[PDB]
Structures are given as C-alpha cells and as structure tokens.
Amino acid sequence: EELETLWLTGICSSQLDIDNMAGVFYMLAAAMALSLITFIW
Amino acid sequence: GSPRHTVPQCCYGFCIDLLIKLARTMNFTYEVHLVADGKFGTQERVNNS
Amino acid sequence: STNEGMNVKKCCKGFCIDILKKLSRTVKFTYDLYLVTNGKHGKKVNNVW
Amino acid sequence: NKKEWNGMMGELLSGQADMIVAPLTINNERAQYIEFSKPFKYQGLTILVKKSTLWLLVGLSVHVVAVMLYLLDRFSPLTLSSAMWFSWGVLLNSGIGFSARILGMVWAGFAMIIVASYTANLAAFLVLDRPEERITGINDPRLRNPSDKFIYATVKQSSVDIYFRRQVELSTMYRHMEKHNYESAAEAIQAVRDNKLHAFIWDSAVLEFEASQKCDLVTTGELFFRSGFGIGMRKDSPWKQNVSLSILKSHENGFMEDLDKTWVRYQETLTFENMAGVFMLVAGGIVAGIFLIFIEIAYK
Amino acid sequence: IIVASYTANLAAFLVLDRPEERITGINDPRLRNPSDKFIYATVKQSSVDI
Amino acid sequence: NGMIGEVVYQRAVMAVGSLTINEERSEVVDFSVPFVETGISVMVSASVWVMMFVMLLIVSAIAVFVFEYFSFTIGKAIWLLWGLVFNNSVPVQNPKGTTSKIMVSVWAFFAVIFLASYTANLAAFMIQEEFVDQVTGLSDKKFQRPHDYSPPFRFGTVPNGSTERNIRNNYPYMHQYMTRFNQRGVEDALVSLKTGKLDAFIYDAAVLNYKAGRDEGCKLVTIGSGYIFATTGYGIALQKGSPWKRQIDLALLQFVGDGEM
Amino acid sequence: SFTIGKAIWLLWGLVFNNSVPVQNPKGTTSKIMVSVWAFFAVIFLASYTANLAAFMIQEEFVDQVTGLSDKKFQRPHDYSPPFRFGTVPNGST
Ligand SMILES: *[C@@H]1O[C@H](CO)[C@@H](O)[C@H](O)[C@H]1NC(C)=O
Ligand SMILES: *[C@@H]1O[C@H](CO)[C@@H](O)[C@H](O)[C@H]1NC(C)=O
Ligand SMILES: *[C@@H]1O[C@H](CO)[C@@H](O)[C@H](O)[C@H]1NC(C)=O
Ligand SMILES: *[C@@H]1O[C@H](CO)[C@@H](O)[C@H](O)[C@H]1NC(C)=O
Ligand SMILES: *[C@@H]1O[C@H](CO)[C@@H](O)[C@H](O)[C@H]1NC(C)=O
C-alpha cells in the first residue's frame, strides 16, 4: 500500500440547466393548452 | 448453546454455485458439510505440549 | 542491415522495480535486470510463443 | 575532474573570509566540511504565488405571453400598452395599479422560478469561481508530473537546489527546474511580478516579508523542510563557543524579538466588483431610455 | 434585511454544516486513542485479527 | 539534578529525551543541532449607498420631468422608489407616467438583481469563519497586571522547569505574580483549563501543540505559532568534548534532508 | 365585492406577491390568517432558495456506457451516432 501510494497517485454561465427549466416550459405549454380549452368553451 | 444437535440442511449461494460449476466441469462427486464452529481459524496455543 | 545492436545501460524505476528490489532484499538473491528485445508481452503464434 | 566550492564558502575556505553572517540555509553537505552555530532563525520552505441567450429567451417568452393575453383581451368571452406593461410588471414585481388570471398565475410562478434559478446561479458561482491553479501543494501530481504551463524553479545553485537534487524521486523536478533557474532572487521576484513564474520555492520568512510588499504576492500555507538560518563558521576555531553562547543569550531575552520587530514582524464578493459595471450599464440604459422617451415626446 | 439574513443563515444551517458521520478508516484520530464511544471490532479469530 | 546531573557528572553519555537548550546548560554540556522547532507558548481555551442615493435623485428628477410633461408624486416618488428597491408591497402611488412606468420597470429589474447580489454577499459573509483570540503572547498587557482587568486571571507553569528559569530571567515580578499559581502536573493544568480552574498556562510550544492536536473537543486554542516566544529547539545533549558530536550532527541533518524526519 | 371565486387567485397572489392586483378585504379574519399563510409563503420561498442552494453541493455526471454489456459494443451500426473503440495490437486483451 505504501508503494501504491508512492507510484499510483491522482486527484479526485447563465445557461445552467435547460432541462428542468424546459420542463417548466412543458408546464407552460400545458397551461396554454388549458387556456385554449377554456377558450373554445 | 447447542452441544450436540447436527442436522442436514440445504446450502446455496455464491461459492456453492462455484463448486457446482467445478463439479460440472471437473469429473468429481462431492460432499458439502459445514464447519463445527463459526470461525475461519487462528493459530493459538492449545493446552498440552 | 544487421540485427546486431548495442546493450545500452539504462535506468529502471517504478512500481514493479520496487517490488523486485524488495524481493531481492527479502529472498536474498542477486539479479541482472534487462529489457526485452522482441516487443510486447507474448502470444502463442501457431504453437510458438 | 576536481570538486570545488564557489560562493561564500569559496571566499571562506580560501581564507578571504572569516565568518559567514548571512541567511545560511543549513544542510548536511555544508555540515560535512565546515562547522556551524545554533540557528538564529527557524524557517522552512514555501511557494510565492500571484492572485446570455436565456435573457433574450425570457424576453421572447414575455412577448408571446403578452400576445396571447392581448388575444384574450380582444376575444373577451391605451388598453394594449396597459396590458403589456401589466405583464411586464408581473414579470418585474413592481408598478401595477378569467383565463387571463390563470395565464398570469403561470407566468408569475415562472418568473419566480427564474429568480430562484438566478439565486441558485449566484450561489453556485460564489463557490465554483475559485481557481484550482492555486495548487498549494508539493504533493500535487501536477508538481510530481510537471506541466509546461506551471513554471516552477528556484535560485540557480542554491541550497534548496541541492536539497531538491538529493530528494527521493524529484529528479523529474530537478530536470524540470533547470529550464528556469535564476541567478538572483530579485530577478525571481521580478519574473513572478511579470506573472511568468507560476510557482517559486524559497525560504519561508523571506517571502512572508515579501507577502506584504504587494497584495497579490501570496505565500502558500505548507511548511516543509524546517531548516535554520545560522552563522557560518570555520573548523575548530576560538570564535565557535562564545559566539553561539551570545546567540542563545540573544534568544533567551527579547533581543531576537526586537530584531523581529525591526523587520520580521514588521509588514508593509464585496459590493464593488459585482455592482460597478452593472451600475454603469444601468446608468447608460437610463440615458438611452431618456432618449427613447424624448422620441415618445416627439411622437405625440 | 432581517428576512434575507434569515434565508441566508437557514441555508447555512441546512446546506454547509454537516457532522462527519463516516470514520475515514485509518485516518481517524478518535480510533488512534479510542474510548467507549467508537466501538470498533471484528470477528473473533478471523484473518483480519491476524 | 535530573538529566543534566546525569550527563555532567558522567554517569551517562547522552540524553535523547526532550530537553530545551539554554545558556547555562550549554555551558555545562555540549549540545547537538536542534531538529524540531520548539519554542514556548501559552495555552488558553460606503460609496455604493452614495451612488444609489445619486441615482435615486436622478430617478426622482426624471419623475419631476414627467410631472413637467404630463400628480402628487413629487416627494412621494422617493417613497415608492425605495419601497420598490426592496419590493415590500407597500401602498405608495400608482405611476400614471409612461416614462415613469418604463423607469419603474428598469429600476425594478435593477432592484431584483441588487437584492440577488446582496444575497450573494450574505453567503460570502457567511462562508468566512474567523477565530478571534484574547492573549497575543507574553507581551500582553494582561500580564503586566492581572488587576488591570477586573477578574484576576490564572497563568501557570510546571515546577522546576526551564520555562521558569526563562521567566525568572525575564521578569522576576512575573514570578512573584506566578507564585500563587504554581501547579504540579501537565495534565493537572489540562484538567484545570477544561474545567475553569485556570486561565492561561505557560509551557513549551510543541508539547501543547501535541496535546491540542489530539484533544477531543478542540476547546483549547494555541496562540499563533511561536512568534513572540523563546524560539529554540530540542537537540541531543552530549558530554563536554565528546567525539560523537560530529556524527550525530551529520545524521540529524541527513534525517531532515531525506524527509524521514 | 366580487371575490367569491376570485379568492383562489387572490390568495395565490398573496402567497407569491408578484405585484398581483388584489381586491383587499375589509375583514380582519382573512387579514390575520392570510398574514400567517403568507409568512408560511415567505419561509417556504426561503426553504426553496435553500433547496436550490443545496442543489449545487454534488458534483457527479453519470457514465454513458455501462460496460461490455451494452449493445452499442455488440453492434455499432444499430445505433445512429458513430463511435469508435480500440485496443493495443498483439496484446493479451
Ligand atoms: C468420470 O470418470 C469415470 C472413471 O474415472 C468415468 O467412468 C465417468 O464416465 C466419468 N464421468 C464424467 C462425467 O466424465
Ligand atoms: C486449557 O486452557 C484454557 C485457557 O487458559 C483454560 O481455561 C483451561 O482450564 C485449560 N484446560 C485445563 C484442563 O486446565
Ligand atoms: C569564551 O568565554 C570564556 C568565559 O566567558 C572565556 O574564559 C574565554 O576566554 C572566551 N574565549 C574567547 C575565544 O573569547
Ligand atoms: C522542585 O524543587 C524543589 C527544590 O528542591 C523540590 O523540593 C521539589 O520536590 C521539586 N518538585 C516539584 C515541586 O514538583
Ligand atoms: C503485431 O504482429 C504482427 C505479426 O506479423 C506484426 O507484423 C506487427 O508489426 C505487430 N504489431 C505490433 C508489435 O505493434
């Protein structure tokens, strides 16, 4: 283990997440679809 | 706890299937039996000698 | 032109080198470490290693 | 093919000198040939280092929301500018005096998700915007296996150079530091001052005095090879015993601490950086808005 | 400013600070000089004990 | 007495145990080079607001210009403005000015990003964790008189030690104030600091660093790193004129120079 | 007074407080209890900001291919993006 420690040693933007925000855009699309449902009736 | 009660039971698992693979590959019958204690085994001074 | 070559002395270090040095200091032998000429590890090239 | 000793040991062993009074880095090699005293300073080694689309997307989004709300305003089961700036004020949380209520509900929840995501963005960038180029480690594999960008060396033919020549595996460093060895320490301070030296190995309290010179002159926190600055001497010589006794006599009282008060102890995110250019760009936007307002005055 | 400081130090209270629930193996000082607190052991007469 | 008495009177050869290096010991024995840095120690337990005010008066002047063009929002615009800096939903005024509505929109965007940046400043103030102290070494003005402050604090050493000789050759009056504080054991003073029966404890630096580096609780805090202190080392004492000095002095520097120390 | 069915959207806007036009009631009852509920809303927004502040603690992006068991390595043309995989020649692998 000492030799393994000696010779084998290694480590370890405003557009962050379009995925979850795009899911909220899917919620927005569901909202405008429900607005169209209330619109036609 | 139990000084004299030894029964045949049913063994299965990892090394059981490994031994089954060995007995299917290599021509030998076998006899699985458990160990009398719950230890791997260490070298320690016995009473005599 | 010829397959003759010089045996240039070079310096080995690393992990297995330390393993070989500690094996030499424990088993207490001597050795003449050298490098391969053919290339990689090995292959049974039509019943020829 | 004869060994030689240059430098202050060259002028001492030739008889031209009598006593080395200097920041003498005590090592084993110089101890094999001359004799020392007990060190006046205890001092190690250290390193001197130096110190978008979604906005326009949300704009197009509030444009589409204003379009569909004004289509609800026309197809009801300056009203145009009032409804548009009603949507803008819902977006900007200030300055406002039935499916439109549902759409404004969804848009206001969306804008609160926007400001919460910006809160997450600033909370991420107040931690992740910290340089890993500030290594602060001799045991870094970036130092063990050197990169051509990280420029580290020391004074050419120093005691630290000999100590790195001796070290157990650092011939990789010893054949890497040969590309940037310097003669004088002042040229090393000038070269790290020009941001050329990404690292520089030197004795601790020297760079700790040089830490307060300029605010970017930063020393690392690791303390390795705890050596001593002492007074260099000859061989067996009558200036060996009582001189070391007088040094330790200076150590027992505060005279060494007086000498520390002369030079050693003596030295020589916020609301500005995140807001200065923002405030100036907002002021320029106010001026351009005033120009567009005078255009609106000349409209009517 | 009070509710902003409250939000900030509650985020401090639930995000940053955390006790070391693990031991990190051989690098625990509380196993170097042990006590009745960290009860560490192994199987009696095992190769780990060897 | 002790190790010095065993070395001087030639009943032994060398002392390898922990031992400080001062003047009279160096008179009576020969020391090696020190290998560990061991001193002594004491153990105990606005222009942003200005430019915001300027732009506030700029915005109020533009609202005055709105009142000049196109109605009680003369001084009330300041109240609406700094209310919507923070967006407290305060009933203030209904801005009828089109210029005023656009200016309120731009200012509210600026107010949102300003409060967001202030939350960033709150987290930045939160991440930094400082460690304030009370005594900054032996040069503390508490040590000049314990009655200068109202509770008489307790500073102590170990008996018959080299630290006592270093104090009694610095200030015998400090020894006179310490005379009522002479305690016996090192762990006795450890328990006395962990309970409250002791305020300060003057001792060697490295031993207190070893005790605090393994202490369950980390309540006891060192003072610096030996800055205003004795600043010496632990060597290996030898006999007067011993031949072993050169080999030990080379070997300790080798032990430093290979990283084995 | 028209806030019979409009009280849902009104209480929504009193939860979130995004400059929603609010028909303010003349009754102390809803004033006190919607003050308590909007206090809950404010501390809920504080908790949601702390949730998004805890969102940046972790640092881990998952792998693309789990290993040899993938049918990408079994068949490369069945998958539309082309990828390449290599070894060393004449080796044990
Ligand atoms: C095993 O060996 C015996 C004789 O050694 C042979 O008769 C038998 O057929 C073998 N069985 C298998 C499964 O190879
Ligand atoms: C054998 O050794 C064990 C261990 O000390 C002891 O307890 C036991 O009494 C011994 N047996 C006899 C017969 O004395
Ligand atoms: C060193 O000091 C001692 C006593 O102080 C004195 O006897 C001796 O002569 C001194 N030696 C030299 C070389 O000054
Ligand atoms: C300190 O020295 C005195 C003087 O001889 C002695 O009586 C005492 O036993 C010593 N030890 C202590 C106080 O622990
Ligand atoms: C692999 O083996 C073949 C066999 O002839 C040889 O031609 C080739 O050069 C080898 N490749 C290597 C060693 O990289």
Swiss-Prot record, chain E:
Tissue specificity of this protein: Detected throughout the brain, in brain cortex, cerebellum, thalamus and olfactory bulb.
Family: Belongs to the glutamate-gated ion channel (TC 1.A.10.1) family. NR1/GRIN1 subfamily.
Name used for this protein in its record: Glutamate receptor ionotropic, NMDA 1
Gene: Grin1
Assembly and interaction partners: Heterotetramer; the NMDAR subunits are modular and harbor tiered domains that function in concert to regulate opening and closing of the cation-selective ion channel pore. Forms heterotetrameric channels composed of two GluN1/zeta subunits (GRIN1), and two identical GluN2/epsilon subunits (GRIN2A, GRIN2B, GRIN2C or GRIN2D) or GluN3 subunits (GRIN3A or GRIN3B) (in vitro). Can also form heterotetrameric channels that contain at least two GluN1 subunits and at least two different GluN2 subunits (or a combination of one GluN2 and one GluN3 subunits) (in vitro).
Binding sites annotated in the UniProt record for glycine: 47
Compartments where found: Cell membrane; Postsynaptic cell membrane; Synaptic cell membrane; Postsynaptic density membrane
Post-translational events: NMDA is probably regulated by C-terminal phosphorylation of an isoform of NR1 by PKC. Its phosphorylated state is influenced by the formation of the NMDAR-PPP2CB complex and the NMDAR channel activity.
Function: Component of N-methyl-D-aspartate (NMDA) receptors (NMDARs) that function as heterotetrameric, ligand-gated cation channels with high calcium permeability and voltage-dependent block by Mg(2+). NMDARs participate in synaptic plasticity for learning and memory formation by contributing to the long-term potentiation (LTP). Channel activation requires binding of the neurotransmitter L-glutamate to the GluN2 subunit, glycine or D-serine binding to the GluN1 subunit, plus membrane depolarization to eliminate channel inhibition by Mg(2+).
Domain notes: A hydrophobic region that gives rise to the prediction of a transmembrane span does not cross the membrane, but is part of a discontinuously helical region that dips into the membrane and is probably part of the pore and of the selectivity filter.
Glycosylation sites: 33
Species assigned in the record: Rattus norvegicus
Curated annotation (Swiss-Prot), chain G:
Binding site for L-glutamate: 92-93
Residues annotated as transmembrane: 28-49
Region (Pore-forming): 2-23
Expression sites by tissue: Detected in brain cortex, olfactory bulb, hippocampus including the dentate gyrus, striatum, thalamus, superior colliculus, inferior colliculus, midbrain and cerebellum (at protein level). Detected in brain cortex, hypothalamus and cerebellum.
Notes concerning its domains: Contains an N-terminal domain, a ligand-binding domain and a transmembrane domain. Agonist binding to the extracellular ligand-binding domains triggers channel gating. A hydrophobic region that gives rise to the prediction of a transmembrane span does not cross the membrane, but is part of a discontinuously helical region that dips into the membrane and is probably part of the pore and of the selectivity filter.
The protein's role, per its UniProt record: Component of N-methyl-D-aspartate (NMDA) receptors (NMDARs) that function as heterotetrameric, ligand-gated cation channels with high calcium permeability and voltage-dependent block by Mg(2+). NMDARs participate in synaptic plasticity for learning and memory formation by contributing to the slow phase of excitatory postsynaptic current, long-term synaptic potentiation, and learning.
Record's protein name: Glutamate receptor ionotropic, NMDA 2A
Native species: Rattus norvegicus
